[PDB]
Design a protein around this ligand. Structure first.
Ligand code: CL
Ligand code: ZN
Lengths: 168, 238
């Protein structure tokens, strides 16, 4: 169900996705696995999928996505809760580069993301400033950059939010 | 707390055609350029990052939004398969590359010095990459924090711009060498030294024989002598 939405979100890019979640009781285990083969330069919508996971759950949670260098491809492991010992990128909004050596991993949780967003004076208004992962697979390393992306036309985004507000 | 995203996600589940356009629509990056400080490790720069050094400061910008990168884009728009094979094939023939050899000739014109230079082919690869994307000067010195030698890539102008594709090639060709941007006596310099491969068996005696036949530019050899004198008390950190 969430995999169906995730494949649709990633349909624009060339990132492979691997094929149940209870909204009342969310699992602690890995929810999704996004793969990115060598040579690729695709972007992962981190903030979007993390906030989608928060809306999916009816019980309070803190969604987390782990990014790993498998030594062949990029791995994006999805979670509703950050597992104990899982890494978090010490990045700021201006300084967002993370280089991953083979078998090394980083990660990002919605709460840690919100702290970064607020500390960088970034706009909190919905879909105006969204963090996305730009990854470049330069073997043996995986190059990551946690950049904040805005829309090309904000007037279009504000009108889309009104359409969502109208149907309520 | 905040639940401002809740009305949108309810709508996004019902409207999939809008969800695709919203995700794809988030393309404009908020931070197009960020300030950096020297000494700066180039290994911190991703594939689309460009480096800019000037009196205006030091900046690590996005190539896709950079005007200096855009101008050079049709010229170097070049595959890695032929690029890796290019500097490997060009390592065999070092005659045209007067700038590289003149540095060896001016400092120590012995075959033992040429033996040590050719022992680290990644340094020629660094020079070859930086030459393409132009009038650089190389300096070979002994690494005091490693019997290996380090190279200083001295830039000619007071303003410096390393293309995103150029530093992508530079870091790739020099995997096993650390590249750090420095400033010394108003001169921007890149220090290429060993941190911790398909390369031809370089005949040091054959190139040494060719060096005797080659007639260098006198003004370039004296320039190197002055440059080596200037970079003696440099002391780059580890
Ligand atoms: Cl250095
Ligand atoms: Zn540029």
């Amino acid at each position: 169900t969430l995999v169906q939405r995730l494949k649709l979100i990633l349909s624009g890019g060339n990132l492979r996705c691997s094929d149940a979640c209870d909204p009342e009781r969310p699992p602690t285990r890995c929810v999704f696995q996004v793969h990115g083969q060598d040579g690729s330069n695709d972007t992962f919508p981190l903030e979007y999928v993390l906030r989608l996971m928060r809306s999916w759950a009816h019980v309070p949670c803190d969604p987390y996505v782990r990014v790993q260098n498998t030594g062949v491809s990029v791995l994006f492991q999805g979670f509703f809760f950050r597992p104990a010992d899982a890494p978090l990128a010490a990045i700021t909004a201006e300084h967002n580069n993370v280089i991953l050596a083979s078998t090394h991993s980083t990660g990002m949780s919605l709460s840690a993301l919100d702290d970064i967003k607020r500390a960088g004076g970034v706009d909190t208004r919905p879909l105006r400033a969204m963090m996305s992962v730009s990854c470049f697979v330069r073997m043996p390393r995986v190059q990551l950059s946690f950049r904040f992306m805005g829309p090309d036309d904000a007037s279009q985004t504000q009108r889309l939010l009104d359409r969502a507000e109208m149907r309520q | 707390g905040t639940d401002r995203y809740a009305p949108y996600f309810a709508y996004a589940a019902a409207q999939p055609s809008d969800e695709v356009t919203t995700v794809r629509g988030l393309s404009n990056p908020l931070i197009k350029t960020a300030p950096v400080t020297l000494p700066f490790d180039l290994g911190q720069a991703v594939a689309d990052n460009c480096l800019s050094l000037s009196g205006m400061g030091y900046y690590l910008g996005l190539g896709g939004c950079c005007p200096t990168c855009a101008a050079a884009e049709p010229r170097l728009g070049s595959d890695r398969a032929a690029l890796v094979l290019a500097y490997v094939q060009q390592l065999n023939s070092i005659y045209e590359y007067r700038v590289f050899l003149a540095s060896v000739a001016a400092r120590d014109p012995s075959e033992r010095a040429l033996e040590e230079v050719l022992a680290h082919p990644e340094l020629f690869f660094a020079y070859y990459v930086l030459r393409d994307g132009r009038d650089v000067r190389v300096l070979f010195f002994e690494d005091p924090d490693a019997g290996a030698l380090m190279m200083y890539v001295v830039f000619p102008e007071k303003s410096v711009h390393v293309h995103h594709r150029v530093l992508d090639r530079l870091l790739g060709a020099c995997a096993g060498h650390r590249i750090v941007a420095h400033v010394w006596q108003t001169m921007f310099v890149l220090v290429v030294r060993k941190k911790g491969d398909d390369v031809p068996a370089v005949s040091a005696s054959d190139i040494y024989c060719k060096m005797r036949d080659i007639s260098f530019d006198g003004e370039l050899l004296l320039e190197y002598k002055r440059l080596y004198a200037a970079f003696e008390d440099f002391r780059p950190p580890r």
